[PDB]
Design a protein around this ligand. Sequence first.
Ligand SMILES: *[B@@]1(C2=[C][C]=C([N]C([N])=[N])[C]=[C]2)O[C][C]([C][O])O1
Length: 237
Amino acid sequence: IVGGTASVRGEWPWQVTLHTTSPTQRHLCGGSIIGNQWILTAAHCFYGVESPKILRVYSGILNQAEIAEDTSFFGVQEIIIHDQYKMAESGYDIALLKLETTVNYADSQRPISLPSKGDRNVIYTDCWVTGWGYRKLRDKIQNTLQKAKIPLVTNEECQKRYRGHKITHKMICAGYREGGKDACKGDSGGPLSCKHNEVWHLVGITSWGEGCAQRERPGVYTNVVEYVDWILEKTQA
Ligand SMILES: *[B@@]1(C2=[C][C]=C([N]C([N])=[N])[C]=[C]2)O[C][C]([C][O])O1
C-alpha cells in the first residue's frame, strides 16, 4: 500500500495474508474471508502454483512478525480459479480458496459481506484498500498491515487513464487524480472494503495498475458484485 498508514489490530478482520512455503515461507497475496471455509482472492495470485499444499492462510494478523513456525494457519483444500481468467489485465481476476478447516469467527477474524446486485447504484464514499504490499514500486513486504482511503472513479474516467487497455464493467477503479495513494505489489487479492450505512462491503479485489500510486493511474480492481452468482455457484456443494 502506497501512501497509507498502520492499521489498528482487528480493524480489518476479514483480511488474511496468504503465504506460500516454496521455496521458503513468504507472503504471497492478500485475501478476504467471505465464509467459514472460503477466502476470496485474485486468480493471478496463483501463477506458478501447482498445488494448494504449499499454501497457508493466516487470519487475525496485524504484523507479519506474528507469523512463526509455531503459528496456527489454515490449509488450502482447493484453489478455484474463474475458468475465463487468463490474466489480471484482461479481467476475471478472481479465485476462491476452500480451506481444509473452518474459521472460528471472533473479533480478530470474521467475514465481510459481499455486495448485492441492488447496490450497483450505491455511491460508496468511504472505501479503503489494505494489505502488506509495497509502499513504493521497488520495496518489500511490509510488516504492519497498511490501510489507505481511496475514492472510486467511474469506469469512463478509468478507461481514459488506461488507453491500450479495455476497462470493462467487471472491473472497478479507485485512486486520486494526483496519485499518492494506491495498492502495490503484495496487495494483490486484497479487499477493497467500502462503508455504506456503516456496513462493510467487499466492493473489489486488488488486481493491477500501471506502476503504483502514479498520477492519473487509478488502481484497477475486480468488480466483486459482478461475480456474486459465480461465487454462489462455486461455493455450493
Ligand atoms: B499483486 C498486485 C496488485 C495490484 C497492484 N497495483 C499496482 N499499482 N501496480 C500491484 C501488484 O500483488 C502481488 C502480485 C502478484 O503476485 O500482484
